[PDB]
RNA sequence: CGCUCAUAGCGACGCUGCUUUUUGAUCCUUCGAUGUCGGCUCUUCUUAUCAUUGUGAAGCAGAAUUCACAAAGUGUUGGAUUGUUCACCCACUAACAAGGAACGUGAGCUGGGUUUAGACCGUCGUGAGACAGGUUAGUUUUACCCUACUGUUGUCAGUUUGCGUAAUAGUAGCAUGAUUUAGUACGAGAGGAACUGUCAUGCCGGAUCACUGGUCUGUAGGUUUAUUUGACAAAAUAGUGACCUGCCGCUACCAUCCGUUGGAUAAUGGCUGAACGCCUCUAAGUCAGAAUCCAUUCUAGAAAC
RNA sequence: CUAUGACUCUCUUAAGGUAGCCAAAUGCCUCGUCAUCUAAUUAGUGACGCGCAUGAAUGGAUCAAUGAGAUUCCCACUGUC
C-alpha cells in the first residue's frame, strides 16, 4: 500500500489514480476530488479535510 | 509480449515528438497491428508502433511517412497489478522499421513501452 | 447490389429468443455427464449473489509477464447458506427422453419448502401441503409403500436426483419461499445414489462439500433486466447520423424487397435482461466459513499477510444486500444477475484439467472499503483511530 | 422535376480515336485500340475492320456525327467511307478516356525502359538496379519526349550524366572460371545468351572463358552460375571498355 | 570472454542482465530460461538471482549497482527487494533511492572506484550514492550524450564511448576518471554501448550481432 | 514458350460451353404513377476461394511464391481526391475475393448528382430558344390498417400448483503475433523453417459494476451572479441561474470476467484385395482425416408428455 | 528554320483576334502538363496556351471596402466521428 500525494491519505491497492507529470514527478491521487484540487493548484493546507491539515 | 493498454491515440492525433532528432510533433496516420473492423479508427495505446508524419519540425524530414513509438499518453490505462497511470501529454519518438530509437528520449517513458522495445529503455531517462 | 463493406454480425443468434427467462432463479438444464468411476457427490448448488469486491493475489502462471507479482482481481461474493435435501426423484431413460419416475419425499418437510407449493400462503388456514404424505411414515402399511417405491427407483431408473432446497429465511432478504431444485447425484451404481439420497433426508449439505477449493464452476443465472430497450444497446447497431428524420437509434434497413418479410435475424428493439445465461469456468478463490449464531465474529476476510480480523463484509455491509453471515464462496469475475439474486451454481460439465483448474489461490488482500462511496478505510476500527 | 428515371448520360467507351482538322472543323472517327498502328505501317487490316463505326464524328466524346452541310464544304465530298480513310491516313492518333493513363503510364514506361540500358557506377565498376537511376534521372531533371527515337533517347540520358557524374558508357569483359564437370550445363545456358571468347577448357583444371558482355548484364551472371551449379564459381574481371556497344553512337 | 548472446533474438543483452563485480542480476524472460546459459558460464562465482525489478524485464539499465551497493527506483515492489536482499549473501548494502526524476540504470554508469552522473541528478542522490557506493561522482556528459549512463559502458581497466564522441571528451575521461578508453561502438547496427555489453573482470556477455573484429577491439580493453 | 521438356506453369492458330455481377437487342407487364443514381445502415444468400482448416501437384532445397481439390464455417480495414459506381494513390493487414437480394435497402435516412421554375458563361440560332456542355441556388409528404419481425400478456381443447423431460427451431467462437523449438532441419552460402508447449493480442459474442472514467433531479453539499422577502439568518424566482465536488444507479476494450469435447464424413494419403495368373486405395469390405456435418454445452420450450 | 511562319497570294463573307486573360462559372480531350498544399488530392492555388468554343461598353484586364453568394486550406474548438 502507498500514501496519497496531495492529501496525505492512505491508498490501498486499486483505489488510486496515478499521474506522472512532464517534470518526471509521479503523483498518486486517491480519487478525482484530490485530482481536481491538484489541477486547480490549491494548496492542501488550505482545505481542512486533508491529512496535511 | 506485453498486455493490452487503453488505446487513446486514434488515427489523426498529433503528439509531441519527445526525440532529439528534429521533430516538434508527430501526426499518427496508422498503427502497426490494427486490422479490420468496419468504420473503426486505428487507435494507438502506449507501446505501439505507429506510422506517422511530422507536421512541424525540421523541413528536411517533414513530408515523409516515418515510424514512431508511443512512449506516453494521457488516456489512463490500468496495469494488471490494479494501479492506473496516465501521463501529462501524448508523445512519440522516431525510429526505424525495426524499432531502433537512434536519438535520445526526453520526458518519462511508460514502462509498457520499455518492455517490447529494448532501445526505448536504453535512451530513456525516466521509466515510469 | 451486394453489401459494400463487410462487417461482422451484430449479435449472437445462439441466444436468439431474447425473452424473459421463465425460471425465476436459474435452471440447470444440463448436469455433468455421469461416470461410474467416481464416488457419489452432488453436482449443483444454489447461492445468492451478495456483492462484489476486489482481491490482490500473486500470479503463478510461469512464462507470463505478471508472474510472482501482485494482481488486483475482482471477485463476486456468492453467499451459500446450507441446502436442505428434502426428497429424491428417479428418471428412467425412454425413447423420448428421461421421464420422472416415482419421486420419494422426506418426512419433516420444512415450512419454507412447503411455501413453494403455495402461491397465497397467508390466506390458507390449514397449510395442507404434504400432510397425507407424512402420515405414511406414521403407520407401516404406508411406510412399506415407501420402500417398495424406493426399490423401484434403485432398479428401474438411471438418474438419481435429490430435490434440494435452500434457506432464504436464514439470510434476510424478504423472502420465505425457499428456492427448490433437483441436483442430480453423480456417482456409480444407482443403489449407491439412492443410498446417498436417503442418507441425506432432512440433513443439510454445505457448499464446501459439493464444490472444492480452487476449482472452476459454472454459474447459471438470470441477468439484470433492463426492460424494453432499443436496438442499439440491445444488439450493438451503429447509430444513424445526426441528420436523420424519423430517428437515429434504429437499424436503418431491415431487409431487402425480396425475401419480402422481416427475417428472424434482423436486429429489432425488444427486451433486454432477465435472460437465462450460464457462465462456464468461474474459478473459486475462497470458500468462506459460516458465521456462528453463538460465538465470536469469524474473520472471513482475514487472509495471510493481512492479519486484520475482518469479514468479507465491507464497511456498512454490502451495498443493497445485508451482511454475509453464512457460508460464501468468492469466485473471480462477474456473474449474471444483480445483488440479491438466486444463482444456481453447478459443477462443470467436463472435468477441467487445464491451467486455471490446476491453479492454487493464495489471497493476500481482500478489499473491505465502503463501496457505498469511496471508502479509504478497511475496518470500522481503523476509521475511528484515523479520525478520532 | 421528378421524372421516374433520369435522363441520358455520357457515352463512356473503350475505343481509340484519330484526328483530322480540315477547313476549320475538327473531325474524328472511332477506331481500334491497337489497329491504327496496324494501318500506318503499310499493313492491311481490312478498312471495314479498322473502324468501330463508319459514320464520321464531329466529337467522339459527345457522340456528335457530322452533316453534309459542313462536309461538302470541308472535304469536297459527302461519301463517308472515303472520308474515314483520309481521316485515318492523314490524321494523328487522338486519345480516349484512357488518354491520361496511356500518356502518363507511357511516360512512366519510357523512363522505366530507356534509362536503364547500360550503366555502371564509379569505383571498380559494377552495375545496379533501376531505381538508383530513377532517383538520379529526376535528380538530373530529365524531361522525356517520344518523337526522338528510343536508341537516341538512350544516348541522350547518359550524355547528361557523363557530363555530370563519372559513369562509363561501354561494354565490359569478364573471365569466367568454372570447374569442368559441374559447369557445362552452366556453359550452354549463357553460350546462346551472350558472346564468348578464349574458350580454354581442360580436364584436370578449370574451364576459363572470357566474355563480350554489356556493363549491366553482370549481376545476373554472378548469380545464375551458382543457383544452377550449387557451388562456388569465380568472377574475375578482364577488361572495362570495349567498343561496338553504344560507343558507335547509332 | 567477449561472447555473443541474445535475449529472444533481440540481441541487446546489455540491459536484461547486469554483470557487476558481484551479484549478476538477470531479467525474467518468460520463455527459455535466459539465465541458464549465463549460469553455465557463471556457476563458478557471481550468483545469478533471476529477479525482475519494477515489473519490468530490464534490470541492467534500470538498476545500476556496484560491488558495494545495488540501486532500485521508487517503482520497485517491496517483495521484489525482499527477494533481491535474500537472493545474495551478505556483502552489499542494497539501497532503494527515493529518486523519481529518472530510471536509475541509464543515468549513473558505475564502477568499483569512480562512477558517472546524469547532470540533474538532484544532490540528495549524490549524498546517498556517496554513502552507499563510496565512489566519486562526476556530473559529466560525453559529446554524444546528456544521459551519460547506457551511452557508455564502465568497468575496471576499461570503458567505451562512440566514434561520434570527440577526442576532447575521451582524453579528459581518461584523465579524470583514470580509466583507459576506446571509442568503439558495440553492435554495429546501433550506437549505444551499455545496451550491448556488460562487463566483469572475467568476462563480458555481449550482443549476438556484434562483429568479431570489433569484439576483439572491446575485449582488448575489457579483459586487458 | 518454359536451357533440353507440348500439357510445373502457360498456350497461339481453331473449336465447344456457361454465367446474367457490363452494355446492347426487344417492347411482354406497368404512363387513372412500382419514387429513378450514389453513399450510410443492416440482414441473408452465391461460389466463380482472397485469407483461415485439411490435402495433392511445381521448373516445391529452406524461405517466398504458383496450380488444383474438399471447402462459403469465420473474416475480408482506416483514409486523401471525386456526387460518384468505377477509378487512383497512401497506410495497416492473415487477407484487404468476386457477387446477388426489384442494378437489395428514400412512409430507413441524406440530397452530393441527375431533374422543373431563378441566373451566368461558352458554342449554335436572325430571334424566341437548344446543349446528351461547365457553374450556382433550389419543399424529400402519410402508417393508427393487414401481414412479417421483435418483445409482452392471455386460452390450454378433473381444478390449482410443484418439480421436470426435451420434440422442434436457433447456435459462436474465428483469427493473429512473440517466444520455446532454433540461428536448428535445409543450404556452398545468403538467408532460414515446421509439430507440440507457453505467453499475449485482434475481431466477435455473453454478461458485469470491486476498481477507473463519464453522467448527476439525490436539485446532496459548497461557491457565486441578478432580483425579491427591511438588514443578519434562511429562503425563493431566473422553465435545473451558473460553476465545483459527488452518492446510489446506469454505464465504456474508456473498466472487468468468461467464451468446451465426442462421433461420422469430404478432399486426400493408405491397408487387405479382385476384376484381368501380375498390378491396383475399390469393385465387396476397411483405416486415418476439414475451420465441415451431427451431437456436446448454450437459447426458447410445442393444441407434446 | 522541312520546327517558328515573317512574307506571299487567292477564297467565301468585309476583316482575320490587337492590348489583355484562361483547363477561368467559359477547355471536348481532361483526373491537361509543371511546381505547390497532403502520408495519399478527379479538389485548391501559382505558372504553360494552336484557346472543341477567351477577348475588349455583346465591354477586356484589375480591383480597396462590403457580401444570410460559390470554393480550398491552416489555427482554435467541439459527440462530426
Swiss-Prot record, chain A:
Give each disulfide bond as a residue pair: none
Identify its protein family. Answer: Belongs to the eukaryotic ribosomal protein eL24 family.
Q: What is this protein called?
A: Large ribosomal subunit protein eL24
**UniProt source species:** Dictyostelium discoideum (Social amoeba)
Q: Lineage, please?
A: Eukaryota, Amoebozoa, Evosea, Eumycetozoa, Dictyostelia
Query: What gene does this protein come from?
Result: rpl24
Curated annotation (Swiss-Prot), chain B:
Biological processes annotated in GO: translation
Cited SUPFAM superfamilies:
Ribosomal protein L14
Taxonomically, the superkingdom here is Eukaryota
Q: Name one GO cellular component term.
A: cytosolic large ribosomal subunit
Q: Which UniProt keywords apply?
A: Ribonucleoprotein, Ribosomal protein
Q: Which InterPro entries match?
A: Ribosomal_uL14, Ribosomal_uL14_sf
A matching Pfam family: Ribosomal_L14
Q: Which GO terms describe its molecular function?
A: large ribosomal subunit rRNA binding; structural constituent of ribosome
Q: Which CDD domains match?
A: Ribosomal_uL14
Q: Does the keyword DNA damage apply?
A: no
| Similarity field | Belongs to the universal ribosomal protein uL14 family.
**PANTHER family for this protein:** 50S/60S RIBOSOMAL PROTEIN L14/L23, LARGE RIBOSOMAL SUBUNIT PROTEIN UL14
From the Swiss-Prot or TrEMBL record, give the protein name. Answer: Large ribosomal subunit protein uL14
Give the originating organism: Dictyostelium discoideum
Instruction: Give the gene symbol.
Output: rpl23
Swiss-Prot record, chain C:
Q: Where is the composition biased (Basic residues)?
A: 16-27
Per UniProt, the keywords (alphabetical) are:
Cytoplasm, Ribonucleoprotein, Ribosomal protein
Q: What is its main location?
A: cytoplasm
Gene Ontology cellular-component annotations = cytosolic large ribosomal subunit; extracellular matrix
Region (Disordered) spans which residues? Answer: 1-33
Subcellular location per the Swiss-Prot or TrEMBL entry: Cytoplasm
Name the residue ranges with Basic and acidic residues bias. Answer: 1-9
Q: Supply the Pfam families for this chain.
A: Ribosomal_L3
Query: Which Gene3D superfamilies is this protein grouped with?
Result: 3.30.1430.10, Ribosomal protein L3, domain 3, Translation factors
Q: InterPro entries recorded for this chain?
A: L3_arc_euk, Ribosomal_L3_dom_3_arc_sf, Ribosomal_uL3, Ribosomal_uL3_CS, Transl_B-barrel_sf
Recorded GO terms, molecular function?
Answer: RNA binding; structural constituent of ribosome
Q: Does the keyword Transferase apply?
A: no
**GO BP annotations, alphabetical order:** translation
Signal sequence bounds: none
Functional description taken from the UniProt entry:
The L3 protein is a component of the large subunit of cytoplasmic ribosomes.
Please state which protein family the record places this protein in.
Belongs to the universal ribosomal protein uL3 family.
Q: What is this protein called?
A: Large ribosomal subunit protein uL3
Instruction: State which gene encodes it.
Output: rpl3
Swiss-Prot record, chain E:
Q: What does this protein do?
A: Binds to the 60S ribosomal subunit and prevents its association with the 40S ribosomal subunit to form the 80S initiation complex in the cytoplasm. May also be involved in ribosome biogenesis.
Biological process terms from the Gene Ontology for this record are: assembly of large subunit precursor of preribosome; cytosolic ribosome assembly; maturation of 5.8S rRNA; maturation of LSU-rRNA; ribosomal large subunit biogenesis; ribosomal subunit export from nucleus
Keywords from the named record: Cytoplasm, Initiation factor, Nucleus, Protein biosynthesis, Ribosome biogenesis
**Subcellular location(s) of the protein:** Cytoplasm; Nucleus, Nucleolus
- GO terms assigned for molecular function: ribosomal large subunit binding; translation initiation factor activity
According to UniProt, the name of this protein is Eukaryotic translation initiation factor 6
Question: What would be the name of the gene that encodes this protein?
Answer: eif6
Protein's UniProt keywords contain Membrane: no
User: Signal sequence span per UniProt?
Assistant: none
Indicate the family of this protein. Answer: Belongs to the eIF-6 family.
Provide the assembly information: Monomer. Associates with the 60S ribosomal subunit.
User: InterPro entries annotated for this entry?
Assistant: eIF6
What is one cellular component GO term in this UniProt entry?
cytosol
Amino acid at each position: 500500500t502507498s500514501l496519497c500525494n496531495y492529501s496525505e491519505f492512505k491508498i490501498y491497492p486499486a483505489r488510486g489514480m496515478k499521474f506522472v507529470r512532464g517534470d518526471s514527478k509521479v503523483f498518486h491521487f486517491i480519487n478525482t476530488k484530490v485530482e481536481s484540487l491538484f489541477f486547480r493548484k490549491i494548496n492542501p493546507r488550505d482545505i481542512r479535510w486533508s491529512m496535511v491539515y | 509480449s506485453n498486455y493490452r493498454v487503453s488505446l487513446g491515440l486514434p488515427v489523426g492525433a498529433v503528439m509531441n515528438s519527445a526525440d532529439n532528432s528534429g521533430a516538434k510533433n508527430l501526426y499518427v496516420i496508422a498503427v502497426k497491428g490494427i486490422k479490420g473492423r468496419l468504420n473503426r479508427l486505428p487507435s494507438a495505446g502506449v507501446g505501439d508502433m505507429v506510422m506517422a508524419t511530422v507536421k512541424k519540425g525540421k523541413p528536411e524530414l517533414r513530408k515523409k511517412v516515418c515510424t514512431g513509438l508511443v512512449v506516453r499518453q494521457r488516456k489512463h490505462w490500468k496495469r494488471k497489478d490494479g494501479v492506473y497511470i496516465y501521463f501529462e501529454d501524448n508523445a512519440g519518438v522516431m525510429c526505424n522499421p525495426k524499432g531502433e530509437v537512434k536519438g535520445n528520449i526526453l520526458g518519462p517513458v511508460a514502462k509498457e513501452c520499455s518492455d517490447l522495445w529494448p532501445k526505448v529503455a536504453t535512451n530513456a531517462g525516466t521509466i515510469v | 447490389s451486394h453489401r459494400k463493406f463487410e462487417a461482422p454480425r451484430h449479435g449472437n443468434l445462439g441466444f436468439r429468443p431474447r425473452k424473459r427467462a421463465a425460471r425465476h432463479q436459474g435452471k440447470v438444464k444440463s448436469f455433468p455427464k455421469d461416470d461410474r468411476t467416481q464416488k457419489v457427490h452432488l453436482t449443483a448448488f444454489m447461492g445468492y449473489k451478495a456483492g462484489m469486491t476486489h482481491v490482490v493475489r500473486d500470479l503463478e502462471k510461469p512464462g507470463s509477464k505478471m508472474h510472482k507479482k501482485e494482481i488486483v482481481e475482482a471477485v463476486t461474493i456468492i453467499e451459500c447458506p446450507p441446502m436442505y435435501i428434502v426428497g429424491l426423484v428417479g428418471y428412467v431413460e425412454t425413447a423420448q427422453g428421461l421421464k420422472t419416475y416415482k419421486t420419494v419425499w422426506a418426512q419433516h418437510l420444512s415450512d419454507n419448502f412447503r411455501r413453494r407449493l403455495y402461491k397465497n400462503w397467508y390466506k390458507s388456514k390449514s397449510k395442507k401441503a404434504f400432510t397425507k404424505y407424512v402420515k405414511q411414515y406414521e403407520t407401516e402399511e404406508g411406510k412399506k409403500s415407501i420402500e417398495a417405491s424406493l426399490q423401484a427407483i434403485k432398479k428401474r431408473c438411471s438418474v438419481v436426483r435429490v430435490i434440494a432446497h435452500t434457506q432464504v429465511h436464514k439470510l434476510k432478504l424478504t423472502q420465505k419461499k425457499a428456492h427448490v431444485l433437483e441436483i442430480q447425484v453423480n456417482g456409480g451404481s444407482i443403489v449407491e445414489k439412492v443410498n446417498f439420497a436417503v442418507a441425506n433426508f432432512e440433513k443439510t449439505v454445505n457448499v464446501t462439500g459439493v464444490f472444492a477449493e480452487n476449482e472452476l464452476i459454472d454459474v447459471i443465472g438470470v441477468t439484470k433486466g433492463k426492460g424494453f430497450n432499443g436496438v442499439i444497446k440491445r444488439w450493438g447497431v451503429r447509430k444513424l447520423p445526426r441528420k436523420t428524420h424519423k430517428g437515429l437509434r434504429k437499424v436503418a434497413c431491415i431487409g431487402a424487397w425480396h425475401p419480402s418479410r422481416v427475417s428472424t435475424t434482423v436486429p429489432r428493439a425488444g427486451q433486454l435482461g432477465y435472460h437465462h445465461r450460464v457462465e462456464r469456468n468461474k474459478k473459486i478463490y475462497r470458500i468462506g466459513q459460516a458465521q456462528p449464531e453463538d460465538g465470536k465474529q469469524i474473520s472471513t476476510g482475514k487472509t495471510e499477510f493481512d492479519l486484520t480480523e475482518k469479514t468479507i463484509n465491507p464497511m456498512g455491509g454490502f451495498a443493497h444486500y445485508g451482511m454475509v453471515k453464512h457460508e460464501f464462496l468468492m469466485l473471480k469475475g462477474c456473474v449474471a444477475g444483480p445483488r440479491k439474486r438466486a444463482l444456481t451454481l453447478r459443477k462443470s460439465i467436463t472435468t477441467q484439467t487445464g491451467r486455471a483448474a490446476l491453479e492454487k489461490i493464495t489471497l493476500k488482500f481482500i478489499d473491505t472499503s465502503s463501496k457505498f462511496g469511496h471508502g479509504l478505510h478497511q475496518t470500522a476500527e481503523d476509521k475511528t483511530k484515523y479520525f478520532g | 422535376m421528378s421524372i421516374f428515371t433520369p435522363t441520358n448520360q455520357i457515352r463512356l467507351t473503350n475505343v481509340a480515336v484519330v484526328r483530322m482538322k480540315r477547313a476549320g472543323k475538327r473531325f474524328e472517327i472511332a477506331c481500334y485500340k491497337n489497329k491504327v498502328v496496324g494501318w500506318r505501317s503499310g499493313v492491311e487490316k481490312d478498312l471495314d475492320e479498322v473502324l468501330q463505326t463508319h459514320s464520321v464524328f464531329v466529337n467522339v466524346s459527345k457522340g456528335q456525327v457530322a452533316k453534309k452541310e459542313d462536309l461538302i464544304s470541308a472535304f469536297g465530298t459527302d461519301d463517308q467511307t472515303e472520308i474515314c480513310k483520309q481521316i485515318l491516313t492523314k490524321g494523328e492518333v487522338q486519345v480516349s478516356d484512357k488518354e491520361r493513363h496511356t500518356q502518363l503510364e507511357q511516360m512512366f514506361r519510357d523512363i522505366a525502359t530507356i534509362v536503364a540500358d547500360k550503366c555502371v557506377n564509379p569505383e571498380t565498376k559494377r552495375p545496379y538496379t533501376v531505381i538508383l537511376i530513377e532517383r538520379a534521372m529526376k535528380d538530373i531533371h530529365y524531361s522525356v519526349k517520344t518523337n526522338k527515337s528510343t536508341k537516341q533517347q538512350a544516348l541522350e540520358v547518359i550524355k547528361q550524366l557523363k557530363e555530370k557524374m563519372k559513369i562509363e558508357r561501354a561494354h565490359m569483359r569478364l573471365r569466367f572460371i568454372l570447374p569442368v564437370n559441374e559447369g557445362k550445363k552452366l556453359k550452354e545456358k549463357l553460350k546462346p545468351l551472350i558472346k564468348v571468347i578464349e574458350s580454354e577448357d581442360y580436364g584436370q583444371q578449370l574451364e576459363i572463358v572470357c566474355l563480350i558482355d554489356p556493363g549491366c548484364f553482370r549481376e545476373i551472371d554472378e548469380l545464375i552460375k551458382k543457383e544452377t551449379k550449387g557451388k562456388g564459381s569465380l568472377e574475375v574481371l578482364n577488361l572495362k571498355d570495349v567498343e561496338e556497344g553504344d560507343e558507335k553512337f547509332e | 570472454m567477449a561472447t555473443r548472446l541474445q535475449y529472444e533474438n533481440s540481441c541487446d543483452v546489455g540491459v536484461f542482465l547486469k554483470l557487476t563485480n558481484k551479484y549478476c542480476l538477470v531479467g525474467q524472460c518468460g520463455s527459455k530460461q535466459f539465465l541458464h546459459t549465463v549460469e553455465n558460464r557463471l556457476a563458478d562465482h557471481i550468483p545469478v538471482v533471476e529477479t525482475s525489478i519494477a515489473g519490468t524485464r530490464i534490470v541492467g539499465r534500470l538498476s545500476a549497482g556496484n560491488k558495494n551497493g545495488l540501486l532500485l527506483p521508487n517503482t520497485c515492489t517491496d517483495q521484489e527487494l525482499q527477494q533481491i536482499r535474500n537472493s545474495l549473501p551478505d556483502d552489499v548494502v542494497v539501497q532503494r533511492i527515493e529518486e523519481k526524476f529518472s530510471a536509475l540504470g541509464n543515468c549513473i554508469a558505475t564502477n568499483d572506484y569512480v562512477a558517472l552522473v546524469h547532470p540533474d541528478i538532484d544532490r540528495e542522490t549524490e549524498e546517498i550514492i556517496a554513502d552507499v557506493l563510496g565512489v566519486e561522482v562526476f556530473r559529466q556528459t560525453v559529446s554524444g550524450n546528456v544521459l551519460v549512463g547506457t551511452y557508455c559502458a564502465l568497468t575496471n581497466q576499461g570503458a567505451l564511448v562512440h566514434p561520434m564522441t570527440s577526442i576532447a571528451d575521451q582524453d579528459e575521461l581518461s584523465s579524470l576518471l583514470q580509466v583507459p578508453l576506446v571509442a568503439g561502438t558495440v553492435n554495429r547496427g546501433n550506437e549505444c554501448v551499455a545496451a550491448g555489453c556488460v562487463v566483469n573482470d572475467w568476462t563480458a556477455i555481449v550482443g549476438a550481432d556484434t562483429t568479431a573484429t570489433e569484439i576483439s577491439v572491446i575485449e582488448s580493453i575489457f579483459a586487458l
